[PDB]
Design brief:
Chain B: One of its GO terms (cellular component) is extracellular space. Chain B: It is found in: Apical cell membrane; Cell membrane; Cell projection, Cilium; Cytoplasm. Chain B: Its EC number is 3.4.-.-. Chain B: Its cofactor is chloride; Zn(2+). Chain B: InterPro entries: Collectrin_dom, Peptidase_M2. The complex is a heterodimer of chains A (about 170) and B (about 700). Chain A is α+β, with helices and mostly antiparallel strands. Chain A has one domain: 2-Layer Sandwich (Alpha-Beta Plaits), CATH 3.30.70. Helix content of chain A is about 10%, strand content about 20%. Chain A is built from four helices and eight strands. In chain A, the strands form three sheets. Chain A has a four-stranded antiparallel sheet with strand order 1-2-8-3, with no helix packed on it. Chain A has a two-stranded antiparallel ribbon with strand order 4-7. The termini of chain A are close together. By secondary structure, chain B is α+β, with helices and mostly antiparallel strands. The relative contact order of chain B is 0.10. Among the domains of chain B are: about 80 residues; about 220 residues; about 90 residues, no CATH class. The longest helix of chain B is centred in the N-terminal third of the chain and has 32 residues. In chain B, strands 7, 8, 9 and 10 form a four-stranded antiparallel sheet that branches. In chain B, strands 1-2 form a two-stranded antiparallel ribbon. A two-stranded parallel sheet of chain B has the order 3-6. Chain B is globular. Classes of the chains: A alpha+beta (about 170), B alpha+beta (about 700). At the A-B interface, loops of A face helix 1 and helix 13 of B. The complex binds a molecule of 6 linked components (NAG-NAG-BMA-MAN-MAN-MAN), a molecule of 2 linked components (NAG-NAG) (3 copies) and 2-acetamido-2-deoxy-beta-D-glucopyranose (2 copies). A molecule of 6 linked components (NAG-NAG-BMA-MAN-MAN-MAN) sits at the interface of chains A and B. One 2-acetamido-2-deoxy-beta-D-glucopyranose binds next to loops of chain B.
């Protein structure tokens, strides 16, 4: 709910996201409600209306630039490359997920290849754990990196456009 | 671990590295096609080189996964697509020779010229020059010059290139574990359904034979009507019983009969539909045309055009100094990028072409959710079938009336529907025997059922028997008449145009049944039909994830190709043609030719190879020269190329006739040639050391 989480110039990749711990009391949530710039504001465990008066011990905010068609994978309870090998949410989730398009900042005409995702892991990720280790994996008869970079072009559809996703955790 | 997991990992990595290269290649191709320059050729060449090298390499790894140990259908289909096409087993010199042969054939087709007999400096290319004559001229002799100069100055160049091309392509297809190149072309329609046996590659041949048998009577009646109308124009050139000459069919090859419409129109006093003036009025531009197409597709429930479609597509010719390719194409660039490149004029043809290309784009965004290998049509006919059935629904006069382009005072009588159905049939029914016969000839050329010494003989036998079209000039093995077509000289399969029409009219009948249409099928509009659009979107959503038989059964209720919807569409035209062809002869004989009545039959009675045939042609030319000098006091330089030989038995008999120099349409009368033979019989019979009894000269 802070300004520096949602207005950061550089956002983290999905495989190595940025978690920010918030323990203040300045949380009005009216900007998030009435911004009308969020493509996804659906969340679970709370009604998203009694959020202003309720208090919590700590608030954890994440940040990734996943593609448009894997914003739905940030929900709990389904598969997908982001949901399995990247950021994974537990079945009992008591936070909120916010996402918006970032074609003007994270896409270019020649392509923006600065954002990476993990294509394969040895085992599925447990909820709320992160791995940054650069390793190669085996396909066919060749060894190649497990981190593939997103191809973010300006002349691409909404499913292939960058989306800055901020996930609150209470 | 298990091979399914390894195949899934390989396919995931291939997709992740493949949308990248496909999108980069598509962007380079778009930058060339909307901005033609030498700088943009190299970028496309580089991007295509990277994509092709990646594809052949990944097919080489893809061959390492055995298909018999995969249970998931999607992985099976993706690996089948990857393993079917890749790097051939051909050696580097043979592959270089094949590439050089293909480039030579394309260059000969694109740069061949035909020069006038009177003006050697007036040489005409095919696309602006000879196509205009073949589509617009009503002169028998000019059309004969254009038809005979082509296939002689171009097809004779393409004959040895095609002879080497057949061998090289058959070797390449045998390297892919196929019987020949025809089997490799028929691999598109092969499926493995879960329930029962699937579609085979021989089943395609059996099905197209059955479909042609079913369409034979309607084509026979249309042929009889066109012959009766083409007897008025060109009198004393068409037999009432025989085949139609190949150079009077509206184009160079007789592929479409649409240019015969001014000659074969019923009820010429009735004006046809032409709303082009109504869009010159009311301020219509290209944007209005494409917005109306988008409105039509929204009316059935299909999605809107994307925001990037309206920004990135080239809907008009650029006002600045940018050279573009003015061919209407719908582009699926990848990563959700759909564009249309077309130079839209304010015309009805451009309106219907916009609806066609928007149907292509709708198919693309429907199957965009599939994996990259499966993002195509169900077979090669489905895309064009969807485009033509959208164009069929849009072009109805009721749709134009509710669009405002047609005045409410316009009344649809029975005469206007006959004109519309005949104009449709000259493009739809007239092209089906030609397509079937050309694909049949190519299939038995690749299979080996036609030997190399019978190519033209079998070509003009099946042209007479199947299409009902006779050649105006006899053609020996020096000619290559199929190679004079674009698709044959540029290595393009042709059966997609055959299957497109059948699938298109099947889809039309299904969607008009769903839309609760009660009238005749040619007056059907699927606008505002959310059920028809729902069924169509269920069809288009599965691109190649399942068999095309299952998709066809899902949309039309039948697993097989059925031409019954096509015959039901043209039923009023069939009834009218049956009523008109009561005083005419329906059908044709394969014996009449334009040169048949004036030819003299020569019997050989006894080493008569091609050299003795050249000597005989020279003797006949000398006798012609002597007769014309000593009888009519005229000098005419008859040559061996002016003596045409037909019905050549290897050593038994043949027929010959003489044509004039500088005029291939001027066949010398048979009495004059007989008098020339009887005038100079001594030299002709002394050139081969024989008497007059052995050469009968009947
Ligand atoms: C779609 O197509 C595009 C085409 O551009 C392609 O983008 C390119 O991706 C590759 C692969 O990720 C990028 O190359 C990597 O880039 C950085 C360094 O790049 C800097 O310099 C280049 C100048 O060329 C700049 O463009 C760029 O912005 C950066 O400033 C490194 O992360 C990578 O090096 C690692 O990988 C190499 C692979 O062999 C190793 O040789 C190398 O040593 C590095 O690996 C090691 O790194 C650490 C070393 O200590 C270690 O911890 C690790 O374990 C490991 O051993 C690499 O060079 C390239 O820049 C992109 N090109 C652009 C942006 O123009 C996309 O990849 C492609 N997408 C898909 C999905 O196929
Ligand atoms: C059409 O293509 C030409 C090249 O043939 C483009 O001109 C290039 O523009 C880039 C970007 O400014 C320059 O770096 C190049 O040097 C230019 N090349 C040449 C040969 O001048 C041109 O921009 C293209 N036009 C459009 C509208 O895209
Ligand atoms: C069915 O589609 C037709 C066009 O094919 C629409 O008909 C016209 O729509 C406009 C705009 O709403 C009206 O002003 C006209 O009166 C309609 N009729 C005619 C004869 O032009 C129609 O709107 C569509 N149906 C629905 C329910 O939207
Ligand atoms: C080439 O020969 C044809 C056929 O002899 C000429 O065309 C006409 O032929 C008819 C009979 O078929 C004659 O009655 C006409 O006199 C011929 N000429 C014309 C001008 O109609 C044709 O003229 C000859 N020449 C060319 C250049 O095609
Ligand atoms: C399609 O676009 C038009 C014009 O913007 C809009 O009115 C309509 O609601 C859109 N349809 C759908 C199904 O989104
Ligand atoms: C399309 O172009 C308009 C007008 O320039 C612009 O406002 C809009 O953002 C563009 N849409 C895209 C790039 O998706």
């Amino acid at each position: 709910p802070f300004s520096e989480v949602f207005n950061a110039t550089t956002f983290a990749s999905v495989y190595a996201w940025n978690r920010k711990r918030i323990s203040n009391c300045v949380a009005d949530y009216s900007v998030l409600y009435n911004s009308t710039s969020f493509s996804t504001f659906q969340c679970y465990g709370v009604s998203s209306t009694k959020l202003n008066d309720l208090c919590f011990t700590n608030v954890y905010a994440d940040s990734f630039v996943v593609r448009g068609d894997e914003v739905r994978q940030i929900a709990p309870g389904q598969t997908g490359v982001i949901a399995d090998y990247n950021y994974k949410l537990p079945d009992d989730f008591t936070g909120c997920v916010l996402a918006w398009n970032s074609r003007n900042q994270d896409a270019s005409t020649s392509g923006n290849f600065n954002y990476y995702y993990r294509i394969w892991r040895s085992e599925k990720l447990r909820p709320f754990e992160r791995d940054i280790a650069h390793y190669d994996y085996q396909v066919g008869t060749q060894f190649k990196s497990s981190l593939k970079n997103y191809g973010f072009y300006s002349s691409a559809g909404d499913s292939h456009q960058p989306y800055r996703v901020v996930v609150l955790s209470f | 671990s298990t091979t399914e997991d390894e195949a899934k990992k390989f396919l995931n990595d291939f997709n992740s590295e493949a949308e990248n290269l496909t999108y980069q290649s598509s962007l380079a191709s778009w930058d060339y096609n909307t901005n033609i320059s030498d700088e943009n050729v190299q970028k496309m060449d580089e991007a295509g080189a990277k994509w092709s090298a990646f594809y052949e390499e990944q097919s080489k790894i893809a061959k390492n996964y055995p298909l018999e140990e995969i249970q998931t259908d999607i992985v099976k289909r993706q690996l089948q697509i990857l393993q079917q096409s890749g790097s051939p087993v051909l050696s580097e010199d043979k592959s270089k020779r094949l590439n050089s042969i293909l480039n030579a054939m394309s260059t000969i087709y694109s740069t061949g010229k035909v020069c006038k007999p009177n003006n050697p400096q007036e040489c005409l290319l095919l696309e602006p020059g000879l196509d205009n004559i073949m589509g617009t001229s009503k002169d028998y002799h000019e059309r004969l010059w254009a038809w005979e100069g082509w296939r002689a100055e171009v097809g004779k160049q393409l004959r040895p290139l095609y002879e080497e091309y057949v061998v090289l392509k058959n070797e390449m297809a045998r390297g892919y574990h196929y019987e020949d190149y025809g089997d490799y072309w028929r691999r598109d329609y092969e499926t493995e359904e879960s329930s029962g046996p699937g579609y085979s590659r021989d089943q395609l041949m059996k099905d197209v034979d059955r479909i042609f048998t079913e369409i034979k009577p309607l084509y026979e009646h249309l042929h009889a009507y066109v012959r009766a109308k083409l007897m008025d124009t060109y009198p004393l050139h068409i037999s009432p019983t025989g085949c139609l000459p190949a150079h009077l069919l509206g184009d160079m090859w007789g592929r479409f009969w649409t240019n015969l419409y001014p000659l074969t129109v019923p009820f010429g006093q009735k004006p046809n539909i032409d709303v082009t003036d109504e869009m010159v009025k009311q301020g219509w531009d290209a944007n209005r045309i494409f917005k109306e197409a988008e409105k039509f597709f929204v009316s059935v429930g299909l999605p809107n055009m994307t925001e990037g479609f309206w920004n990135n597509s080239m809907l008009t010719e650029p006002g600045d100094g940018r050279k573009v390719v003015c061919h209407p194409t719908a582009w699926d660039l990848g990563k959700g990028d759909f564009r249309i490149k077309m130079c839209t004029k304010v015309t009805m043809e451009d309106f219907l072409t916009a609806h066609h290309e928007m149907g292509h784009i709708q198919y693309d965004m429907a199957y965009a959710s599939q994996p990259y290998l499966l993002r195509n049509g169900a077979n090669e006919g489905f895309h064009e079938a969807v485009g033509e059935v959208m164009s069929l629904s849009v072009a109805t006069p009721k749709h134009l009336k509710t669009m405002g382009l047609l005045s409410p005072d316009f009344r649809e009588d029975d005469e206007t529907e006959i004109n519309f159905l005949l104009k449709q049939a000259l493009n739809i029914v007239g092209t089906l025997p030609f397509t079937y016969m050309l694909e049949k000839w190519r299939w038995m050329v690749f299979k080996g059922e036609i030997p190399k010494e019978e190519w033209m003989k079998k070509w003009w036998e099946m042209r007479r028997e199947i299409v009902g079209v006779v050649e105006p000039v006899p053609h020996d093995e020096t000619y290559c008449d199929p190679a004079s077509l674009f698709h044959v000289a540029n290595d393009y399969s042709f059966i997609r145009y055959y299957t497109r029409t059948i699938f298109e009219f099947q889809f039309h009948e299904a969607l008009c049944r769903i839309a609760q249409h009660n009238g005749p099928l040619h007056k059907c509009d699927i606008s505002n039909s959310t059920d028809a659009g729902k069924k169509l979107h269920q069809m288009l959503s599965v691109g190649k994830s399942q068999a095309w038989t299952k998709t066809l059964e899902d949309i039309v209720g039948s697993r097989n190709m059925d031409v019954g919807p096509l015959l039901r569409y043209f039923e009023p035209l069939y009834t009218w043609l049956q009523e008109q062809n009561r005083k005419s002869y329906v059908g044709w004989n394969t014996d009449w030719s334009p040169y048949s009545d004036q030819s003299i039959k020569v019997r050989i009675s006894l080493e008569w190879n091609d050299n003795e045939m050249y000597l005989f042609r020279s003797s006949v030319a000398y006798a012609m020269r002597e007769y014309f000098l000593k009888t009519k006091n005229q000098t005419i330089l008859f040559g061996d190329e002016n003596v045409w030989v037909s019905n050549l038995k290897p050593r038994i008999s043949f027929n010959f006739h003489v044509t004039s120099p500088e005029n291939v349409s001027d066949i010398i009368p048979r009495s004059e040639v007989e008098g020339a033979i009887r005038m100079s019989r001594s030299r002709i019979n002394d050139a081969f050391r024989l008497d007059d009894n052995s050469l009968e000269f009947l």
